[PDB]
Enzyme design. Structure first.
Site, PDB file in Angstrom:
ATOM      1  N   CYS B   7     -24.003 115.076 114.811  1.00 58.64           N
ATOM      2  CA  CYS B   7     -24.664 114.566 113.614  1.00 58.64           C
ATOM      3  C   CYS B   7     -23.675 113.819 112.696  1.00 58.64           C
ATOM      4  O   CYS B   7     -22.655 114.362 112.316  1.00 58.64           O
ATOM      5  CB  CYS B   7     -25.320 115.718 112.870  1.00 58.64           C
ATOM      6  N   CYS B  10     -23.037 115.723 109.420  1.00 60.28           N
ATOM      7  CA  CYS B  10     -22.204 116.908 109.655  1.00 60.28           C
ATOM      8  C   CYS B  10     -20.737 116.508 109.774  1.00 60.28           C
ATOM      9  O   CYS B  10     -19.863 117.178 109.223  1.00 60.28           O
ATOM     10  CB  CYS B  10     -22.623 117.688 110.914  1.00 60.28           C
ATOM     11  N   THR B  96     -33.427 107.829 108.112  1.00 55.40           N
ATOM     12  CA  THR B  96     -32.610 107.419 109.242  1.00 55.40           C
ATOM     13  C   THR B  96     -31.939 108.686 109.762  1.00 55.40           C
ATOM     14  O   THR B  96     -32.312 109.217 110.818  1.00 55.40           O
ATOM     15  CB  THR B  96     -31.617 106.309 108.827  1.00 55.40           C
ATOM     16  N   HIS B 101     -30.406 114.636 102.837  1.00 54.29           N
ATOM     17  CA  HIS B 101     -29.496 113.961 101.905  1.00 54.29           C
ATOM     18  C   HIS B 101     -30.271 113.499 100.677  1.00 54.29           C
ATOM     19  O   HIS B 101     -31.295 112.830 100.812  1.00 54.29           O
ATOM     20  CB  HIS B 101     -28.766 112.766 102.536  1.00 54.29           C
TER      21      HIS B 101
HETATM   22  N1  LIG Z   1     -21.174 106.392 103.204  1.00 51.44           N
HETATM   23  C1  LIG Z   1     -22.018 106.291 104.246  1.00 51.44           C
HETATM   24  N2  LIG Z   1     -23.331 106.103 104.026  1.00 51.44           N
HETATM   25  C2  LIG Z   1     -24.156 106.025 105.117  1.00 51.44           C
HETATM   26  C3  LIG Z   1     -23.652 106.076 106.415  1.00 51.44           C
HETATM   27  N3  LIG Z   1     -24.692 105.962 107.269  1.00 51.44           N
HETATM   28  C4  LIG Z   1     -25.809 105.805 106.546  1.00 51.44           C
HETATM   29  N4  LIG Z   1     -25.471 105.830 105.245  1.00 51.44           N
HETATM   30  C5  LIG Z   1     -26.435 105.716 104.140  1.00 51.44           C
HETATM   31  O1  LIG Z   1     -27.275 106.840 104.280  1.00 51.44           O
HETATM   32  C6  LIG Z   1     -28.490 106.538 103.640  1.00 51.44           C
HETATM   33  C7  LIG Z   1     -29.559 107.143 104.511  1.00 51.44           C
HETATM   34  O2  LIG Z   1     -30.715 107.259 103.685  1.00 51.44           O
HETATM   35  P1  LIG Z   1     -32.180 107.429 104.346  1.00 51.44           P
HETATM   36  O3  LIG Z   1     -32.784 106.046 104.523  1.00 51.44           O
HETATM   37  O4  LIG Z   1     -32.128 108.235 105.608  1.00 51.44           O
HETATM   38  O5  LIG Z   1     -32.807 108.124 103.172  1.00 51.44           O
HETATM   39  C8  LIG Z   1     -28.612 105.013 103.514  1.00 51.44           C
HETATM   40  O6  LIG Z   1     -28.683 104.606 102.132  1.00 51.44           O
HETATM   41  C9  LIG Z   1     -27.368 104.513 104.253  1.00 51.44           C
HETATM   42  O7  LIG Z   1     -26.762 103.312 103.755  1.00 51.44           O
HETATM   43  C10 LIG Z   1     -22.297 106.236 106.597  1.00 51.44           C
HETATM   44  O8  LIG Z   1     -21.783 106.288 107.753  1.00 51.44           O
HETATM   45  N5  LIG Z   1     -21.518 106.338 105.502  1.00 51.44           N
HETATM   46 ZN   LIG Z   2     -25.972 117.393 110.323  1.00 52.18          ZN
END
Ligand SMILES: Nc1nc2c(ncn2[C@@H]2O[C@H](COP(=O)(O)O)[C@@H](O)[C@H]2O)c(=O)[nH]1
Ligand SMILES: [Zn+2]
Ligand SMILES: Nc1nc2c(ncn2[C@@H]2O[C@H](COP(=O)(O)O)[C@@H](O)[C@H]2O)c(=O)[nH]1
Ligand SMILES: [Zn+2]
Lengths: 115, 115
Positions: B7, B10, B96, B101
């Site tokens: 993950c 994680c 995603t 989060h």
């Molecule tokens: N700092 C950081 N943010 C991430 C990474 N992968 C995804 N994100 C952020 O995680 C968030 C996922 O939010 P979701 O759309 O799942 O609510 C997105 O705003 C995306 O830009 C990463 O590897 N590093």
């Molecule tokens: Zn996790």
């Protein structure tokens, strides 16, 4: 004077002001947003008056956890293909009503646009 | 195989993948969003792997309450003029990463646009 007599969401929760009820129990009240920004747009509030998320304390954190659990129960029923939960705190977030309320948004592929 | 080994969040929480850390403790990890949609855009995660808000149970609701309390502590420090908290569950919300989060958004008067 008292919140029960002054707060719009306290009054909606006591059905002193009408709303379209989605769910209620002794702890929470959920109703349709009057000015929706998604095809499903539900507000979930505690019946008790807590002004915003900044009023969560180490002591009431368990109760807010319970409210969020119930938000999830409502979301997964009303929005089986996914939903977004939003809480607004203060001026920059546009918080209008000072009685904590969680937005449940869904019913379409929701935009993710610059704010 | 295990979440610890698979993950992305994680691994970020264990500093096995780099991030710009805002706050961490034994329970939570908060870091800057890589693709921000606001001038302040912080992600707060539990270090433990919980896939989404739909995995909150009557039994872990207190811990999620604690996470939300800590979200508020981070928000009120980083965003004294207000902040918005967002959680995305499933397809329609665009979730995603399947590790819960909370988005903390602020630093400007945040838009409230149709989704
Ligand atoms: N700092 C950081 N943010 C991430 C990474 N992968 C995804 N994100 C952020 O995680 C968030 C996922 O939010 P979701 O759309 O799942 O609510 C997105 O705003 C995306 O830009 C990463 O590897 N590093
Ligand atoms: Zn996790
Ligand atoms: N059903 C209902 N929704 C309301 C009423 N007053 C405000 N709202 C909704 O409450 C929400 C307040 O969200 P805020 O901007 O404070 O996060 C808005 O989406 C607004 O349309 C009302 O009297 N009835
Ligand atoms: Zn109230």
């Amino acid at each position: 004077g008292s919140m029960a007599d002054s707060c719009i969401f306290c009054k909606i929760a006591q059905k002193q002001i009408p709303s379209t009820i989605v769910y209620e129990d002794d702890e929470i009240f959920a109703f349709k947003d009057i000015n929706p920004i998604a095809p499903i747009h539900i507000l979930v509030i505690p019946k008790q008056h807590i002004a915003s998320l900044n009023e969560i304390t180490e002591e009431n954190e368990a109760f807010i956890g319970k409210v969020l659990y119930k938000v999830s129960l409502i979301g997964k029923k009303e929005c089986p293909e996914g939903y977004r939960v939003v809480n607004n705190i203060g001026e920059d977030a546009g918080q209008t009503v000072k009685h904590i309320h969680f937005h449940i948004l869904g019913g379409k592929k929701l935009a993710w646009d610059k704010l």
